[PDB]
Amino acid sequence: MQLVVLTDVVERLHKNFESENFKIIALQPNEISFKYLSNNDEDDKDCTIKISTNDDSIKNLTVQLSPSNPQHIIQPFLDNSKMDYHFIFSYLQFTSSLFKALKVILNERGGKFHESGSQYSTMVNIGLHNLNEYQIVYYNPQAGTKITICIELKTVLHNGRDKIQFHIHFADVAHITTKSPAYPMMHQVRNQVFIRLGNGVACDPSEIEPILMEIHNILK
Amino acid sequence: MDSIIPAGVKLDDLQVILAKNENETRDKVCKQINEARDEILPLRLQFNEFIQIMANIDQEGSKQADRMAKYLHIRDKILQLNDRFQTLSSHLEALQPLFSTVPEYLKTAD
Amino acid sequence: YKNKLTVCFDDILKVGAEMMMQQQGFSQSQQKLLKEKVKLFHGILDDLETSLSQSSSYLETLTAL
Amino acid sequence: FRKEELLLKDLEIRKLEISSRFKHRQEIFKDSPMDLFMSTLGDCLGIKDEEMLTSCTIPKAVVDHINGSGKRKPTKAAQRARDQDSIDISIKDNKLVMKSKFNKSNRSYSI
Amino acid sequence: HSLIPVAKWFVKFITYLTQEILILINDPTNKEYTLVHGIFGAKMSRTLILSILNEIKKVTQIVAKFPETSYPILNESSTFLKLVLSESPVDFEKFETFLVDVNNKFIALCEQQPSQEREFSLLVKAEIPPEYAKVGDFLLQYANNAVISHANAAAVYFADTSGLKISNSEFFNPEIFHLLQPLEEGLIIDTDKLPIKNRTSKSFSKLLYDDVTCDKLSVSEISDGKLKRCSRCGSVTRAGNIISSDKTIVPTSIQTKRWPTMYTRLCICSGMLFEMDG
Lengths: 220, 110, 65, 111, 278
What we know:
part of a larger assembly, 5 chains, B: mainly alpha, about 75% helix, C: mainly alpha, rod-shaped, Mediator of RNA polymerase II transcription subunit 2 (chain C), Mediator of RNA polymerase II transcription subunit 15 (chain D), Mediator of RNA polymerase II transcription subunit 16 (chain E), transcription, Divergent transcription
């Protein structure tokens, strides 16, 4: 029964995770160690799935994520929410590129001593509300300024069909006037970016990772 | 409860006091900040659960006693919400003397 | 921050007070008021968490130094 | 066609009763947002005031004055005021009483 | 009261065209969204909506001038009519000036160069001839600053305008929305060749929304067999029949002959309406 349910899970994943980075590292009766991201390490499991089997099927499929994997910040929300496993896999495949982009962003600041006295006053950390949105705010204690970038999952009607796209935009609170000392960089981002309707930027996940770096190119 | 850090004492005197006693107060404040960090998340989780309950009020209701049970449950929920607010207020006021040195240090370093 | 957490949970009931007053459909103004109230509650919770982390880190660095 | 006339009259009486109800409620329990919320929500459900529970205790001065049966006699002006109001209001043992004056049946307030 | 469900589709319609304005600005080379050009190009439609907005103002002014006073409980329908106009995501006055300015600009262009095919193009072709490529650029640039400046840009883009029943793909069920036989066999199809689940008129179309009063169809109205289908456009409507008490202002057994009785035998597209088989 354990093997049959594992085979069913693997078949469903193959149906839902058709990507060139999908691979299984270690197979265990009680846990799953498979790699679906672009992590170079062979034995590092990007996603860990614990197997809790019952007389007929798996009781619960708990998703565990490696600390090196940037996706570990969503672990408590996955743990406390009993959502469909297929839906969880769909969300993971839909947001893997976003996770890679934010991994690059956080590793830019997380680099070790490069023998440069460029002690930047801006620190990048991830703000979290729920599974529907992921938020990034730039902490500057020296200048006393904030740079909030919210990424929500909003549905938009497209050719008689509703689609979900990443809504990368500045919050409605960001009605920053020209008088702010840090306003130059928000204004530059607005001028050079603001599918753009003036405030929001809806993007295809297959194309979020270059455009976010285009936003991050100004940031870096 | 216990006032390890006296009120009105200067920062340097607190440094001298902290330098000794083998860091029992350091252990206590580390435990307090750890439990505050481990309490931050469950408050968010249960608050989202309360929002979900409020939004789904028009579902799974067919008997009047069901409303009695559900609304007694929610009133109890906000009961432990106010209790937890009081507990976190106590936690922050316990660390209030410790945080009181930060404004003085910042203004002296200015 | 002590007053903000008290008023925010008092205001979310205050924001709803007019919502069930008409109940005693839904107005879009009240719905967006509730949305901004809950999102600001989450934001101030995150800000307080960040402030606590920064204060803690200052604590260890000053104790070490 | 007296049926529709009495339905509409009952609806108007209900709306004015609800108006007096919330204008009195917002001031009697102004200090407790919890109590106001739970009271108005239970009355939206249709719960009699004698069954629901209160977390806080109200002062006894308002109870003594609203009835006047104590040492201080009720004011004749207060008598006229309570006559002109559409709802008979009184508190018995830290709990008020609410009863419809036109329909004695179990008027369900549920939505 | 019965006009309220119609007004919901009336507001839901004007939002769809305004939504396409924002989309077309970013990518003007998309040929799949050329329908937006023809709608504004139609000359009587701009006047027709203005007349609708005129009588809407007249009705509201008359209702304000002559409100219901004997029974306050009956004022809900009158009050709701005022509320739905004010609570609309886009102001009607700003949208009223939008179509008015288009008419004047499209009249002076006729005097600049005489042409009669443009009248056909703006009404039927829903396209602009290549010789008038400069005219197409004017619609994209001017529409952004005219009305959108007074509305919420973020809200209209994400607004739920789906279910308008405009395209044919969302009229018939997806099982049968395809060619079934080769052109050699002809265009008319015998019923016996249809799929077993698709051999009845009930499975031909989406029986979810109404087409005359623009109201949602409940389970009771679906199952009573008193609804009608148009043999021409596939529309489904329960017009010409007494409405249930739950759809009235107050639940009652009084039977009232409502305006749907105009379309008892003739559909909206001049087609015939027949009792839907169960």
